Ligand binder design. Sequence first.
Ligand SMILES: Cc1cc2nc3c(=O)[nH]c(=O)nc-3n(C[C@H](O)[C@H](O)[C@H](O)COP(=O)(O)O)c2cc1C
Length: 104
Amino acid sequence: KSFVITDPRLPDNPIIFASDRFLELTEYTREEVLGNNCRFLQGRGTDRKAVQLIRDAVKEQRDVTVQVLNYTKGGRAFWNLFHLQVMRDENGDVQYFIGVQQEM
Ligand SMILES: Cc1cc2nc3c(=O)[nH]c(=O)nc-3n(C[C@H](O)[C@H](O)[C@H](O)COP(=O)(O)O)c2cc1C
């Protein structure tokens, strides 16, 4: 499956881990994605109401399954059934965010 692990304890919640399937789907390279926020997958046609949800979840720290339109590195648009999981790996506190992308 395609997914990335982001570390919210860092500035701008950057991708610290990206599964190979992710790199395949998005056509980017690991040297390019590591350390950057995932918003780079959004484009001109990406509904902002959809991104407002994903934004609410990350802040309110909840899970969300949102269908949003993203773009590969080449410029090809594709639908992304996006699923956000909160690695509360701690004892209360949030340690990581797990994002799973499914090209629908
Ligand atoms: C682990 C993780 C994975 C994400 N994956 C995606 C993605 O594949 N596509 C997307 O459009 N946004 C994705 N996001 C959401 C954006 O990074 C960002 O939270 C959203 O664009 C709203 O925040 P901003 O207003 O700072 O851009 C992901 C967020 C997290 C925490």
